[PDB]
Design a protein around this ligand. Structure first.
Ligand SMILES: Nc1ncnc2c1ncn2[C@@H]1O[C@H](COP(=O)(O)OP(=O)(O)O)[C@@H](O)[C@H]1O
Ligand SMILES: [Mn+2]
Ligand SMILES: [Mn+2]
Length: 269
């Protein structure tokens, strides 16, 4: 079977309990994770150890907190105490775990299932070919020896409008924001980088990225995490918002793809 789980945010106990609930069996089953594996929850170290050990039985996309962790590890950004990253950063296998983490994709595609995954979703300004190329470019810099220069460059809220003519720093920043920070769009599809609330309480003319028709969503189901204020509701057919806020005292959600059956694990704190 195929299982898709939203943002774990260091909630290792809840992850393991949910996976035992569905009897997840590496070799017979595959697990999809929406990213933001780490931070806020107490168990980022255990989460990373486990997900890395799954190997080919897991398909991960990186989220904004995974990228932030990489930036802290490389000394680009400052550690926020609330993230609870110190046990992972000080772990004897920190190098192993994080060098593995920076090699993981921003985008997963399964053609037989017609299924696409990224942390924040797919901007309506991208077709599948363009999303693929952008994911490849950013993954290539993330997996290179020079990845801390990229991590430093990534921070920023501009430009927020895609164009194939974008070059250099602006292009990489947009790609990063579209995959890992996107929530609301302007009607022309341009990113808004500020509002993090639920769609009903957002100001006009902002609309959810998935409320705007785009070539990828027209042909593929899209699964994503990231947008916890959504609470996994209010999406159209073929759009699966899996982040139900486990680190926030909400719930960890698992979707079995074959029968679209949901399994839910309450937060422990
Ligand atoms: N149910 C909710 N309603 C409104 N805001 C929320 C809700 N849940 C989380 N948030 C807020 O959303 C902000 C962004 O957090 P989140 O959606 O989890 O994304 P990320 O993990 O990338 O930081 C947090 O500052 C939190 O306070
Ligand atoms: Mn996120
Ligand atoms: Mn998150």
């Amino acid at each position: 079977a195929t299982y898709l789980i939203g943002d774990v945010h260091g909630c290792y106990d809840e992850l393991i309990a949910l996976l035992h609930k569905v009897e997840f069996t590496p070799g017979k089953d595959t697990l999809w994770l929406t990213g933001d594996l780490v931070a806020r929850g107490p168990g980022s170290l255990d989460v990373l150890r486990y997900v890395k050990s799954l190997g080919d039985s897991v398909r991960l996309v990186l989220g904004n907190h995974d990228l932030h962790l990489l930036a802290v590890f490389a000394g680009i950004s400052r550690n926020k105490p609330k993230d609870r990253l110190t046990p992972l950063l000080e772990a004897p296998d920190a190098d192993e775990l994080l060098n593995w983490l920076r090699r993981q994709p921003l985008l997963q595609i399964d053609e037989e299932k017609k299924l696409v995954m990224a942390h924040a979703g797919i901007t309506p300004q991208w077709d599948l070919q363009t999303a693929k190329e952008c994911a490849r470019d950013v993954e290539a810099v993330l997996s290179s020896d020079s990845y801390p220069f990229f991590l430093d460059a990534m921070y920023g809220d501009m430009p927020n409008n895609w164009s194939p003519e974008l070059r250099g720093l602006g292009r990489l920043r947009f790609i990063t924001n579209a995959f890992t920070r996107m929530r609301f769009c302007f009607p022309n599809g341009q990113l808004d980088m500020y509002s993090k609330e639920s769609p009903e309480e957002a100001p006009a003319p902002l609309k959810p990225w998935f409320a705007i028709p785009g070539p990828v969503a027209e042909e593929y189901s899209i699964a994503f995490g990231h947008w916890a204020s959504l609470e996994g509701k209010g999406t159209p057919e073929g759009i699966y918002a899996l982040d139900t806020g486990c680190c926030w005292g909400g719930t960890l959600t698992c979707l079995r793809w074959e029968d679209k059956q949901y399994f839910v694990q309450p937060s422990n704190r």
